[PDB]
Amino acid sequence: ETVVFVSGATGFIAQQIVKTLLEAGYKTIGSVRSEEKGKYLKSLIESAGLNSNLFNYVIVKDIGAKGAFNEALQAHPEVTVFLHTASPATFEIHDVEKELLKPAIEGTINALNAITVYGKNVQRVVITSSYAAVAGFANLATPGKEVNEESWNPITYEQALENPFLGYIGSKKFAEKAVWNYIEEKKPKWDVTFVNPAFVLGPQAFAVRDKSKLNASNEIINSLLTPQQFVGYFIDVRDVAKAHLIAFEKNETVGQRLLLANAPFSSAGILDIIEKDFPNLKLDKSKSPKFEETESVVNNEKTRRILGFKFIDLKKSVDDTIKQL
Ligand SMILES: NC(=O)C1=CN([C@@H]2O[C@H](COP(=O)(O)OP(=O)(O)OC[C@H]3O[C@@H](n4cnc5c(N)ncnc54)[C@H](OP(=O)(O)O)[C@@H]3O)[C@@H](O)[C@H]2O)C=CC1
């Protein structure tokens, strides 16, 4: 009876969501940008021993476009759960409002409109948001201070306009705000849950494509193998994926923001792990790091209690990432 729609299903996080849904036996519909991406994903699922009869794809070439999901939800009236995992990709930015904040905000509204009008059987929407909407960064960072599932990044709309880096952060905050504004205003019959991941690391659900460059967050790792250093909170992608299932499965997740952050990390600390665990790689050397004393402290025991499983630690995450390469 439960049919789960997953937007942008070929992505790094979304492929792990799709794999997790199928291991749990859920009928799954993934949106892909092309027939080839859909056939490719189905073949990955087949070659992994999963029941590929549980998976189908729909072609949605442009996920932020007006009405982009209208036809998919006509063709699949059985959808009861909609995991909106993806925001449209962005590239070289010249107009931060028009190229970053606008497509992010309008993309989520356009998706919510289509769900409300065409997804008449949808009971739960899960929004993949971001830890960026929860804690403050750069000069707005609050090192030593606690953030929890109710905290918001204080960045204002105008502050987000200043440069692409803050525009990306602001895009996450104000896209999620658009969802909250849509609920209060239009009062849809479906319930919402948010998953707010920090830096997502870990192995790909199925396959390599190109060992030379992985998804953006995992370039924190592959850059070392291949370096802009980083600091903050990490979360293993498999924990992000499991959290999306709990997000629609439980009643206590309605109106909740699940803070998907495990433990602090640095790029140097990840290099230390690769140095100790992969001796045939003795790599590259750096030193210009940040120290975590720019980061808020995460209190997410509420999330960890709702999720009810133990997170994968950084060593296992990094080890599993390297093994695929
Ligand atoms: N990874 C992280 O650390 C975090 C990621 N997120 C968010 O989660 C989402 C995906 O994360 P991740 O999986 O890591 O990124 P990936 O690049 O691995 O996945 C990107 C996905 O977005 C799809 N996509 C992008 N633009 C469009 C578009 N215009 N029309 C249709 N499909 C589109 C891609 O389609 P194709 O496969 O066809 O290229 C791909 O499926 C992003 O929105 C990201 O901001 C949130 C918090 C942290």
Side-chain angles (χ1 to χ4, degrees):
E1 64 287 289
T2 295
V3 182
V4 186
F5 192 102
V6 182
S7 74
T10 49
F12 166 59
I13 296 169
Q15 279 202 38
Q16 283 281 17
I17 291 170
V18 164
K19 182 169 153 195
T20 308
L21 286 161
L22 294 181
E23 288 172 344
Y26 281 109
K27 297 186 214 94
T28 296
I29 300 156
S31 90
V32 292
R33 277 202 282 203
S34 68
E35 173 77 21
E36 282 74 29
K37 297 267 183 54
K39 282 177 162 161
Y40 167 74
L41 184 45
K42 200 148 197 169
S43 83
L44 294 183
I45 291 160
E46 271 254 30
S47 308
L50 292 172
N51 181 8
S52 61
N53 288 327
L54 294 175
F55 178 79
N56 288 289
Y57 60 86
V58 292
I59 284 78
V60 172
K61 297 170 186 179
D62 197 22
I63 50 165
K66 226 179 283 281
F69 292 105
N70 289 1
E71 281 69 46
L73 296 168
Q74 282 174 253
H76 293 276
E78 69 269 12
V79 171
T80 64
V81 177
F82 196 110
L83 313 195
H84 190 44
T85 73
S87 39
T90 63
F91 311 112
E92 301 261 295
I93 310 295
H94 292 329
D95 191 326
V96 166
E97 186 163 30
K98 199 184 75 174
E99 285 138 31
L100 275 170
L101 281 137
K102 284 314 315 188
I105 292 168
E106 297 175 329
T108 84
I109 301 309
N110 288 347
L112 294 185
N113 286 331
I115 290 158
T116 293
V117 173
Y118 298 90
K120 300 321 227 225
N121 285 322
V122 173
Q123 294 162 29
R124 308 284 300 248
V125 173
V126 178
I127 298 289
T128 310
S129 180
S130 173
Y131 178 65
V134 173
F137 295 84
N139 49 328
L140 309 188
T142 54
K145 282 75 96 193
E146 169 183 312
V147 298
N148 61 20
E149 293 89 352
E150 310 295 315
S151 316
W152 280 87
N153 185 338
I155 188 172
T156 79
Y157 191 82
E158 289 77 19
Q159 282 173 328
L161 267 49
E162 280 312 289
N163 60 63
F165 169 75
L166 296 177
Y168 175 80
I169 297 307
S171 81
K172 301 310 195 176
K173 170 185 181 170
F174 292 101
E176 195 192 314
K177 282 285 186 189
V179 184
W180 291 108
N181 293 338
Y182 186 100
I183 302 308
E184 61 187 70
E185 158 178 352
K186 314 220 184 179
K187 306 307 295 177
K189 287 195 189 176
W190 42 261
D191 291 323
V192 78
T193 303
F194 297 87
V195 180
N196 292 67
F199 290 95
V200 185
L201 310 170
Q204 314 285 133
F206 295 117
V208 198
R209 284 215 162 170
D210 203 347
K211 291 181 204 204
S212 286
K213 302 249 279 218
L214 311 167
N215 61 283
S217 64
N218 264 321
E219 272 311 315
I220 293 172
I221 296 169
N222 205 27
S223 85
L224 275 39
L225 295 201
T226 279
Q228 226 294 309
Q229 294 167 101
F230 288 82
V231 71
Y233 283 89
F234 97 97
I235 189 76
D236 187 274
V237 61
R238 289 161 295 189
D239 295 335
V240 179
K242 285 194 290 201
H244 279 81
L245 268 74
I246 296 160
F248 70 85
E249 276 169 344
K250 296 188 171 195
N251 292 280
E252 61 172 337
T253 49
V254 175
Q256 295 293 286
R257 306 161 86 214
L258 306 166
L259 209 156
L260 266 289
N262 191 351
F265 82 96
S266 65
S267 285
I270 292 175
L271 185 69
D272 288 2
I273 293 167
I274 302 160
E275 261 156 39
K276 177 165 148 248
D277 295 1
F278 293 85
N280 278 324
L281 293 181
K282 255 161 205 225
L283 263 166
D284 49 328
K285 286 142 195 68
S286 39
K287 198 258 158 275
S288 289
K290 320 80 192 147
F291 303 163
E292 175 104 4
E293 312 328 319
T294 166
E295 298 312 319
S296 312
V297 174
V298 157
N299 178 5
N300 67 339
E301 258 55 50
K302 182 179 192 188
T303 291
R304 302 185 200 243
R305 166 191 65 73
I306 293 150
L307 294 181
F309 61 90
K310 175 171 161 93
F311 292 152
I312 293 160
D313 53 49
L314 182 63
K315 173 187 173 59
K316 186 183 171 7
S317 194
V318 175
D319 285 341
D320 291 346
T321 309
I322 312 291
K323 284 180 59 231
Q324 281 179 343
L325 305 178

